[PDB]
UniProtKB/Swiss-Prot annotation, chain A:
Function: Calcium-dependent cell-adhesion protein. Essential for maintenance of normal retinal and cochlear function.
Localization (cell): Cell membrane
UniProt-recorded name of the protein: Protocadherin-15
Glycosylation sites: N45
Involvement in disease: Usher syndrome 1F: USH is a genetically heterogeneous condition characterized by the association of retinitis pigmentosa with sensorineural deafness. Age at onset and differences in auditory and vestibular function distinguish Usher syndrome type 1 (USH1), Usher syndrome type 2 (USH2) and Usher syndrome type 3 (USH3). USH1 is characterized by profound congenital sensorineural deafness, absent vestibular function and prepubertal onset of progressive retinitis pigmentosa leading to blindness. Usher syndrome 1D/F: A digenic recessive form of Usher syndrome, a genetically heterogeneous condition characterized by the association of retinitis pigmentosa with sensorineural deafness. Age at onset and differences in auditory and vestibular function distinguish Usher syndrome type 1 (USH1), Usher syndrome type 2 (USH2) and Usher syndrome type 3 (USH3). USH1 is characterized by profound congenital sensorineural deafness, absent vestibular function and prepubertal onset of progressive retinitis pigmentosa leading to blindness.
Quaternary data: Antiparallel heterodimer with CDH23. Found in a complex with TMIE and LHFPL5. Interacts with LHFPL5/TMHS; this interaction is required for efficient localization to hair bundles. Interacts with MYO7A. Interacts with USH1G; this interaction may recruit USH1G to the plasma membrane. Interacts with TOMT. Isoforms CD1 and CD3 interact with TMC1 (via N-terminus) and TMC2 (via N-terminus).
Residue span(s) of domain Cadherin: 3-99, 112-221
Native source organism of the sequence: Homo sapiens (Human)
Expressing tissues: Expressed in brain, lung, kidney, spleen and testis. Found also in the inner and outer synaptic layers, and the nerve fiber layer in adult and fetal retinas. Found in the supporting cells, outer sulcus cells and spiral ganglion of fetal cochlea. Expressed in cytotoxic tumor-derived T- and NK-cell lines as well as biopsies of nasal NK/T-cell lymphomas. Not detected in normal or in vitro activated peripheral blood cells, CD4 or CD8 lymphocytes or NK cells. Isoform 3 is expressed in brain, heart, cerebellum and kidney.
Domain notes for this protein: Cadherin repeats 1 and 2 mediate calcium-dependent heterophilic interaction with CDH23. Three calcium ions are usually bound at the interface of each cadherin domain and rigidify the connections, imparting a strong curvature to the full-length ectodomain.
Length: 221, 224
């Protein structure tokens, strides 16, 4: 018979296969330990294993994914008595940002491509137009919705990656933190009728994992 | 007094902060209380920031910062015992934290980002799939893992190609993309009176449950 009647572990979703994720039967706290097929949670015996049947330590056998599954009920049997180990997956930083709005493409987890829009009158000063209004507003968030603790959450950096015509940096500046768009110089429609830019949103923590969107800017009368 | 002149560990780049990554001082295999602490290494300054010994008496090494195979793959960790030092060489193993990239990948100046791609094709009107297939795309559609050194090779995901979205909306009637080769097939003759051009978005993703997709444009002109 078992000392507690149920047990609990957490595992970061990035934990490599082969890592030992629970040792709590060691130290008088639990004899041959083996994992049972759990009818109520079929995939748990595929995801976790006890390689050394005498110590009862549990090793991760398949790669986890917070987006697919966050809780496992692992039935462990001893030689007879069973117990349930509940294993909660902790969300890890394996995804980058997404721009909003994100309308999912049917039968995917991918956002439908997005082209933000702006329109600038010709021959008017930065002074009269700034900030330039983008529709919908430029806005990105982490696809990782439940990183803990909150101090581990990255910020997002916005930028203009590339664009046509190639002299766009002369006319536009994007704020790296707010995505606010600034005209730097009046535009003459005799020389520029439209700009087509690619905007980037990335994480500031050394793991950019960037998302991209379009920004089309019309130049009016 | 250390038992070996130097030591060696590997660590997967995805290993969470807080994980214990080397235990090889623990079973009488280190020095002969006995206190293990990490020194600043002048020749590798960031190693003492990346690794720590929280329990000074057991000498086990715990990862303190998140690793990145793309920035750095080898650490020289100086460990001192109280007194005598030794070097632990730590190799980072490439982990699956990046998805594919379409080729060619020409880097955008001052970024690590591929310049976006629009693949091109041009189909004559009124000609059969039989006479045109496979449709020639320029450059050829093709993606590879951004993770360049995954080991062993049996751990490498396969790549799945698809047409994500497109305009005009009846493109699936005329075009099929092979999920594994990216080969593009015309399914039906095109009449230029009804269809002049197609603008598609192509996706390349991993088949291992961690898609991490890349996207590219495919423009198709319909000629005389
Ligand atoms: Ca995640
Ligand atoms: Ca993230
Ligand atoms: Ca990698
Ligand atoms: Ca990969």
């Amino acid at each position: 018979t078992f000392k507690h009647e149920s047990y609990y572990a957490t595992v970061n979703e990035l934990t490599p296969v082969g890592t030992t994720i629970f040792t709590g039967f060691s130290g008088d706290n639990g004899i041959e330990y083996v994992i049972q097929y759990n009818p109520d949670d079929p995939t748990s015996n595929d995801t976790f294993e006890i390689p050394l049947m005498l110590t009862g330590n549990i090793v991760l056998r398949k790669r986890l994914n917070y987006e697919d599954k966050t809780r496992y009920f692992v039935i462990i049997q001893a030689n007879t008595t069973t117990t349930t180990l509940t294993v909660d997956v902790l969300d890890g930083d394996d995804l980058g940002p997404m721009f909003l709005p994100c309308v999912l493409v049917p039968n995917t987890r991918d956002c439908r491509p997005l082209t933000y829009q702006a329109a600038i009158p010709e021959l008017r000063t930065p002074e009269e137009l700034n900030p330039i209004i983008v529709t919908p507003p430029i806005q990105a968030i982490d696809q990782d919705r439940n990183i803990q603790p909150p101090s581990d959450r990255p910020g997002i950096l916005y930028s203009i990656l590339v664009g046509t015509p190639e002299d766009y940096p002369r006319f536009f500046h994007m704020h790296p933190r707010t995505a606010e768009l600034s005209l730097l110089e009046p535009v003459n429609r005799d020389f520029h009728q439209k700009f087509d830019l690619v905007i980037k949103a990335e994480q500031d923590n050394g793991h950019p994992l960037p998302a991209f969107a379009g920004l089309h800017i019309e130049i009016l009368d």
